[PDB]
TrEMBL record, chain A:
Protein's name in the database: Fatty acid synthase subunit alpha
Family: Belongs to the thiolase-like superfamily. Fungal fatty acid synthetase subunit alpha family.
Automatic annotation (TrEMBL), chain B:
Protein family (similarity comment): Belongs to the thiolase-like superfamily. Fungal fatty acid synthetase subunit alpha family.
Entry superkingdom: Eukaryota
Protein name: Fatty acid synthase subunit alpha
Portion of the full sequence shown: 1405 to 1597 of 1887
From TrEMBL, chain C:
Organism encoding this protein: Saccharomyces cerevisiae (Baker's yeast)
Underlying gene: FAS2
Protein name, per record: Fatty acid synthase subunit alpha
Family: Belongs to the thiolase-like superfamily. Fungal fatty acid synthetase subunit alpha family.
Amino acid sequence: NKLFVSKEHAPYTDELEEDVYLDPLARVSKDKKSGSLTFNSKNIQSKDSYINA
Amino acid sequence: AMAATATDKIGRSVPAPGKGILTTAREHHSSVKYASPNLNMKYRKRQLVTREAQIKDWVENELEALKLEAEEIPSEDQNEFLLERTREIHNEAESQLRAAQQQWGNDFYKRDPRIAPLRGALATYGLTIDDLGVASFHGTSTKANDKNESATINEMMKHLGRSEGNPVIGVFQKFLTGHPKGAAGAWMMNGAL
Amino acid sequence: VTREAQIKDWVENELEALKLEAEEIPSEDQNEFLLERTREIHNEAESQ
C-alpha cells in the first residue's frame, strides 16, 4: 500500500521558489543524498542554458 | 497580449497563494551581453519582407505550373479547376505568409528562453516593461494576498529590468464592491479599459 | 522540402552575415556573441 506517496517537500525550496518561476530551464536533478529529485542553485538562471534553448 | 494561470502542484492546499505567476517572467539571463536582436522590430521586419519574396516568387513558380498541368490534364473544363487550385494557391500563399508574421510579429518569443512572454507580450508593439503603467490587484484585504500579491510584482520587475523609479500603481477595485468570488477578474478587467 | 531549401539557404545567407557583422562590431569577445546569435539562427531556422 505505497503506490501513493504524499509529497511532503517539493523539489524547489522556498529559497529557490521564485528563482525558477521565470528561469525556464531549471531541470531538477538526482539528489544522491536522498535519491530524490530536487533543484540545485547550480542550474538556476544559469545562462549556461538560459540561452541554449 | 498576455493571459495566464499558474499553480505550485496537485490540488494540495487551497487557501494560500504563491509564486505561481512569476513564471510569466521566466527568462534566462545567463548571458545578456550580446543583445537578442529579436526584440528590435527592424530585425523582425527584414526577416518578414524577406520571406514575402519567397512567398511571392513561390506562387508564380506554382501558378505557372498550373498552365502545363491544369489544361494538360482535363478538357477545357479548366477554370473550374484553376479556380479550384488557383484560389487555393492565392490562399496557401496567404497562410504561408501569416505564419511568417507570428514567427516575426507575435510568436517570436515562445521559442526563446531569454525573453519572457511579458517582454514579448509587449515588445511586439515596441513597448517595454517600463511601460506597464499599472497593476490591478486582487486586492482582497487579507494579511497575505495584499502581501504576496505585491512581493511577486517586485521580482517580476526586479527580474525584467524595470527602471528603479518606475513603480506600478496599485489599483484596488474592491474597496467599493467586495469580493465577487469568481467575478473579480472582470470587474478589474473592466476597469482596466 | 521546397521551403526547407528556403529554410536552408536562408541561414547561410544569415550566418555569412554574422562574419561581416559579429566581429566588425565588437572586440574579439566574439563567440559569446556568435553563440548568442548563431544559436538563435540555428534556432530561428528550426522554428522557421
